Ligand SMILES: Nc1ncnc2c1ncn2[C@@H]1O[C@H](CSCC[C@H](N)C(=O)O)[C@@H](O)[C@H]1O
């Protein structure tokens with residue numbers, strides 16, 4: 211009688227931790243969701259093969275409206291696992307599911323896995339220097355999300371880096387590219403005119419972290435906005451004030467213009 | 476010809492990913508460092524047994540000063556792995572090691588693993604709400620550092636959470652407890668009187684993240700300062716104003732007093 215939230219990691223089925231795999235293999239029932247992120251280097255079949263169990267995939271509605279009607283009932287008399295991409299609790303609302311579990315009288319455990327939130331380290335930007343993060347959401351109808359612009363502004367004023375999660379609509383198989391995020395940010399700049407995001411802004415793009423050959427690129431928006439960063443998922447970062455070694459890494463590893471080596475203290 | 480930066484994860488030998496384990500097994504040489512952090516839930520012997528390889532431990536000096544003497548020469552004509560607790564390149568100075576490898580004509584790849592930066596999601600605090608992070612260091616001689624206090628002040632001012640790493644003498648295997656961190660912060664408050672950290676401040680303590688039985692506690696400093704959070708490592712978080720959902724999780728899962736549902740939201 212238990213429920214395990216088990217993260218599957220960044221890119222493929224092997225990004226699960228040994229702990230997560232060993233526990234999943236012993237569970238009676240295994241559910242999963244793939245709407246919170248995209249694992250571009252695997253399939254349901256490969257994951258099932260690895261854990262040696264059939265996996266029931268749930269939709270956002272199954273989870274958000276009927277988790278306690280679909281999964282919890284089984285966890286009352288069996289060992290159940292719920293798999294998610296990356297870490298199950300990062301930039302999702304899954305933490306609240308632990309409350310539902312408690313109320314169902316079901317004990318729950320969390321098995322972590324590599325998350326994009328810490329994977330940002332491969333960009334060379336010091337992780338402690340990141341400030342508030344935000345998500346660039348697709349405009350819908352007449353609704354045009356813009357709060358993420360204010361987040362960048364706030365962090366930038368403090369000299370902090372801004373991590374921008376990009377939108378996803380898994381049911382339509384829509385994954386926002388860093389290019390699309392940049393276009394939206396330029397449009398928000400045209401509206402608010404804070405001088406926060408322009409053609410001259412330095413940005414960093416990380417695509418398919420977790421793969422052996424992820425795309426890591428840094429440069430000015432005017433130069434990267436039309437660049438091909440490969441298949442999704444992508445994340446966009448707007449760095450704040452750069453330390454010398456951060457700039458050095460961006461130039462040497464992410465191909466940034468050599469002129470950024472010249473930090474403006 | 477290749478150097479693999481492989482993360483060991485959070486707490487024990489099973490926190491490495493399946494990908495990390497399989498790659499480490501194929502490497503000709505395996506190095507590791509435990510100066511950035513320790514893996515309190517395991518031993519070098521258990522990690523070696525799991526990987527089935529002899530592991531050469533490197534000191535901070537070995538890495539910071541002689542990485543190119545010790546690791547790169549071998550990576551020039553062999554497959555070499557460099558194991559680090561958590562997720563690779565999260566430690567501030569590690570990204571630069573990839574530049575060293577490039578300069579030496581050595582290819583490098585990063586194999587991610589769980590990091591405390593993302594694992595803190597188990598506290599129920601929204602990851603996007605975390606601001607700049609800091610480390611609470613022990614005062615020594617005539618040196619009494621207090622910058623971490625200012626980090627909390629600036630984050631809290633903006634409604635953001637502050638992740639506070641606690642000092643470690645990993646080489647002497649000495650950990651700073653959340654209790655000691657609280658005592659220190661109260662002293663800094665005494666000196667700065669900014670109204671940033673007091674007996675009435677709500678804090679969250681996370682101990683042994685990665686374990687199947689971590690300690691997650693939330694409450695006011697006056698009530699938690701002398702509480703036993705179990706064995707280290709401990710991390711301390713000073714949350715900013717809470718979303719009701721965050722508060723509900725802290726009450727239901729972290730045993731926080733119902734009082735936070737009206738005072739800290
Ligand atoms: N492997 C990856 N590479 C690049 N971006 C990624 C990524 N995985 C997730 N992302 C980013 O994060 C967004 C989903 S938010 C969910 C994150 C997940 N819980 C985790 O811990 O990693 C994606 O739309 C994308 O913007």
Ligand code: NA
Pocket residue numbers: 337338340341592605606607608
């Ligand atoms: Na952060």
